[PDB]
Design a protein around this nucleic acid. Sequence first.
DNA 1: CACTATTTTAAGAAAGTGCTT
DNA 2: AAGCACTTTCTTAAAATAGTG
Lengths: 53, 88, 91
Amino acid sequence: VLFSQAQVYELERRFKQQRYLSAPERDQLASVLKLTSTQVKIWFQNRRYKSKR
Amino acid sequence: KIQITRIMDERNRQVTFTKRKFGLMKKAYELSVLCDCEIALIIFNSSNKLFQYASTDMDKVLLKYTEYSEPHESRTNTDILETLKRRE
Amino acid sequence: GRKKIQITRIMDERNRQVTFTKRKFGLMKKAYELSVLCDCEIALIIFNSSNKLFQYASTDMDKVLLKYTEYSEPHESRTNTDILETLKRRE
DNA sequence: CACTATTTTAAGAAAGTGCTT
DNA sequence: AAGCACTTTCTTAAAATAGTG
């Protein structure tokens, strides 16, 4: 199942500020969006892969 | 929403090539069966590798092609783009 | 479409001709899109049931057919039976 | 030969795999 | 642990088109 428009909005907003998150950034973002730390880690990896054209 | 321009990333180009090559062969198969026609499809990719489909014996279609003398519908990329633009 | 159709010969001549004209253009449009998106040279040869010829080629038909006839390496080759087998394997 | 309700296609999203850093 | 470089499995917007006026 896909993330809410609100979750993807916040992930994209953070991504344009920092392409890589530390563990504390990732775990706190996961807590605010109500996703697992894994889901944020993998969203960041997939987003970086997609930005390479 | 898809602009028809070269996919410049090789990895994305190859994923689209594989999906759309099968999609095109599937539509050729459907047209050949629905409308009782003979179709040959030759594809050379950017490395000049050959992929082919034919609804029937390829050599019989190509022989009929080479012996055909009458004027007939003949489309290319240039005139397909012009047709699509005229649907403004 | 307004209804799903089975892929079987259309027995009504008028419906067969209307479908042929619409789908032939749709097929040539998809060949054009593949050619441009993925930098491919393509030839498409169609004989209808009366043996009339309709063709598409990306840039030049004779160049693609010459490259075809000179190609000596083994290469992917598909028939109606292989397309059907692929579609079945997608349950 | 134009329209549009409906089906079909293919691009894109989250997760899977199996390496390397 | 997490990155990386694909790959798989889907979802769903976008495109095609079957029946229709």
